[PDB]
Amino acid sequence: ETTALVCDNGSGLVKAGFAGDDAPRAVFPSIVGRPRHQGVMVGMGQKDSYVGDEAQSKRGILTLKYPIEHGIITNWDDMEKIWHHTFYNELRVAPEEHPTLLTEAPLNPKANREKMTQIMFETFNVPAMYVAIQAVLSLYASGRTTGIVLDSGDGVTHNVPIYEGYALPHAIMRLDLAGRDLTDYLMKILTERGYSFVTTAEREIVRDIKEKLCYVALDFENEMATAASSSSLEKSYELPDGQVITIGNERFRCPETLFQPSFIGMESAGIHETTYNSIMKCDIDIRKDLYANNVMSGGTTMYPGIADRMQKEITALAPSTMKIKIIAPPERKYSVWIGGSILASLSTFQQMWITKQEYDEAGPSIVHRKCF
Amino acid sequence: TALVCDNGSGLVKAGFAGDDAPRAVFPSIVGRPRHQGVMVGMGQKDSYVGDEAQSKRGILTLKYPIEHGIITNWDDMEKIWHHTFYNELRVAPEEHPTLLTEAPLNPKANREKMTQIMFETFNVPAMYVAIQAVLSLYASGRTTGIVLDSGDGVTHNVPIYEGYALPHAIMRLDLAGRDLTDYLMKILTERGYSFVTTAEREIVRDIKEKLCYVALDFENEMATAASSSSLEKSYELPDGQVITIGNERFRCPETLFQPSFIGMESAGIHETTYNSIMKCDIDIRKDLYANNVMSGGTTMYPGIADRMQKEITALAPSTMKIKIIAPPERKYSVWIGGSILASLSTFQQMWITKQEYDEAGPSIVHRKCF
Amino acid sequence: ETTALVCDNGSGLVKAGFAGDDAPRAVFPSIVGRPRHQGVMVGMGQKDSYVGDEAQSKRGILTLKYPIEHGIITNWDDMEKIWHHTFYNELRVAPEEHPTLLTEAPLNPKANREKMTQIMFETFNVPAMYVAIQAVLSLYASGRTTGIVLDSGDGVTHNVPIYEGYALPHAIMRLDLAGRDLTDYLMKILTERGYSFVTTAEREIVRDIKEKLCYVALDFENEMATAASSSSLEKSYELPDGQVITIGNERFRCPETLFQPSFIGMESAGIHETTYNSIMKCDIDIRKDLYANNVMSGGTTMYPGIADRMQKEITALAPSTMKIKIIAPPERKYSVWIGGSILASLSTFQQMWITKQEYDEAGPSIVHRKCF
């Protein structure tokens, strides 16, 4: 009778809702904003902190902080504020009568999961909770059991291969390059045309420009030559103060760091090379079934050129007698949450929760013996 | 309707007595999971038997219950027999007498535990145990001759005169297709290919079944392979990679004629056959030389009959006629001979029934059975 | 007076010197470093590549490559640079007056040995060269003639049984699990405490941590229990930037992969089981002398718990009436080189060289005729 809750706490967005539904009920940014200027009018309900869309609307007088960086919760009072906001104000529920399913990136610190368990059991005390891997939930939402998931969000980009319900944890790859790094690189290369975005409020403007105007080039050198020849690739964007800026090659130089990390000084290889190395680290008899089942999930995989570029690069890397298929659904921005809405709804899952009695018996160390 | 089951070291060939071909031919492997299961909307078993193992071997560790002809694991043999009776044949073992096969020169406790398991767990009205090379001679339409039975675990040379095997001339060589698969895995490291896992052992087995052959003259074949690339052949891996082998095609089966390639003390199959013939009386040696019968899958290399003819002609006296019979269906020849034997009229009183097992115990198979 | 050179080209280190000496004169890493950034100051040297210790000195601005992976040379131009820096910079000799002795792991590709012979004879042109197995040189240095040698370095762990100078080829076993895989596994499991190491320069730091702090437990489960029970097995290490890390139970989980290869996803058996299988593939009358003369060589056999653990495991596998003695010399990090100098200083080895005229007559295939 008790309805389970599915909460996906990424680095940039919080997607929370109920199990068994199709879409998340509450999608809001994971920001806590605090005032930085001098308040002069008395009273009028001035608050010392702002969470979510209220922090985004008043961001001209606020300093915005993200509690999670690179998939790791760095500030815990702000994370308590985020969880209190998504339980009492957005979802409008009482957490003492709802089990909770949370998500986590692979190769994370164990103390993050231990403190998530301790805070969910001692502050918002739940009957049950469970922490799950996001790529497994993406594979649940895809409707299949075999595939290699490339999940790229705001802090982490990770590859997880799964064959017939069995994961290969030695081939799991994690890269700390995601949409916030692309936002910072776009902020850096916007100064070549004279545009200066420095403050934490203007990072959101640069993120909006990246979401609206950036795309992935199929050929990088041909697109650079096309931009250098004619002004057919230039687009205009209107700033909130009415200013109009114009960008050319910076539309496709920004997500190219996903394929050339050396643009931001990283020594690692691209996401296509990471996916190929994750496939080639698996057993030989499963690789074919991986090659036809490349699944992309997350916001950073939402550029309108990325599936064709990934297919071209993997087809260049793979032998020619193999079929390479990139699976990009239109709902892949929320796919992890949809997997939670599947996984908490299964009758075979209800014995996998971590109850309060088990937490009192074992402490906050049962989350490693219970969750993978 | 009787049941004929050939439980080889590498394959299981089972069917009904009277049919001309086996109905269930599947690998004798048990696969178990190796990695961490993360999805709960799945069947999620713990043991896979047969082709279901071969369709899932990339996440599985494979085990053979039979090693070098003798049964090492009896729980896995129970699983093999259960899958044979209930999933591949769709029969009830309470209604059908079952014929079983056994390699010659084997420990007696293997037959003891075979009869005990077949009468206590998979209860049959009757059962019988037969020698494989005798059935392979029976399937070829003759009653006198020498059978070279080479399979997955053992190679045997059995001479049979007037339907009776001669036990003082039965020769056993502990070299068969599993050792050839492992030797091919060892010698593919020279060209840079690494095969370690039990799943890749099946890939190398497929390579051996597809590309290898027997050279007529080994030194001349090695000379021609080192002169030009006219013997190189290509194979496409399951992941799309292309490998090329030039002289491993004939070096791997040469262990049948030179067993020291894998470090075994015994002589080759030609000397083994000549020794098995030469232990017999002089008046039957002409019939044994004229009736050489090949059997099993390891005799399916496309050069083995001519090479065996050349070597036995070299060993034998020059006035002796050497004829080697290699039937095209010799991969299924123990089963066909068992089908012929189980469909005979007078064989029906040679069944070991359950009442005689109750009155005797797990030792009747050494008195009523051979 | 043409003294011979003994050069051991491992996967991680190069140990080179003169025959007759008791210690290698040049021990340096087998790396080539190339710049990953741009040079803004002019008037310097600024060479395009760095070999050996100079690559390790400025590894923060270089990406590092190993020309030898799992005992097999993959990059041959980098191996040209390594051998040139060995002959002309670390030894200061001209390799036209010294015959050379090289080492190779067993069950290697034939093209590696053919190309080594070719590059020795018409690039660094030598009067003579020989290629020898490493484990027989370890037994030559150990002073015995019968026994089974476990050589474990940076790329290949191999077991070779030798009876009265006869290497037994059908019981030689090879595993591609060595110290580099251990370094990668420690790099992976260091992310549980939050320590993230990504670049190729940080792999050297993790290798230094492994060399300083890791050890082999006698009983793994009791060690895990006492690590979880008390904070008495923790140790601290200082990074180059001054930060301090602490590891408690990663010290014995990292070399547990040598005994449980399933930690990195491999299906193979442990080194103790490989040793027992190598002994069981020998003749039945020589297994007593092989069980009494177990010799450990290489750098991965330098953990300070490995001899007692190997003794316990082999005594478990062996029959109860057998005597098991495992010999670990204190100088076993350089044991292939010492036996190589012993072999090259012998009077009856002077007919076993491959001369230049023989290479001219027979081409680069006489190394399969004159060398084992």
Ligand SMILES: Nc1ncnc2c1ncn2[C@@H]1O[C@H](COP(=O)(O)OP(=O)(O)O)[C@@H](O)[C@H]1O
């Ligand atoms: N259409 C789009 N094009 C490019 N980037 C996008 C798009 N939509 C969202 N993003 C990026 O995705 C990132 C977060 O995606 P998501 O994975 O849904 O959140 P989280 O990482 O918090 O789970 C943001 O940094 C945002 O810039």
Ligand SMILES: Nc1ncnc2c1ncn2[C@@H]1O[C@H](COP(=O)(O)OP(=O)(O)O)[C@@H](O)[C@H]1O
């Ligand atoms: N075309 C072929 N060429 C060479 N060997 C083969 C061929 N087909 C099958 N084999 C070998 O025959 C062996 C098994 O044959 P068979 O005797 O029918 O089974 P079992 O040995 O279990 O009785 C396998 O190990 C396989 O390697």
Ligand SMILES: Nc1ncnc2c1ncn2[C@@H]1O[C@H](COP(=O)(O)OP(=O)(O)O)[C@@H](O)[C@H]1O
């Ligand atoms: N004291 C030690 N403890 C643990 N590992 C060590 C120790 N000393 C060396 N090693 C490891 O041994 C490896 C190389 O050893 P060695 O066999 O001497 O070189 P190579 O493998 O190049 O021949 C290095 O990767 C290093 O990590």
Ligand SMILES: [Mg+2]
């Ligand atoms: Mg996310």
Ligand SMILES: [Mg+2]
């Ligand atoms: Mg058979």
Ligand SMILES: [Mg+2]
């Ligand atoms: Mg070495």
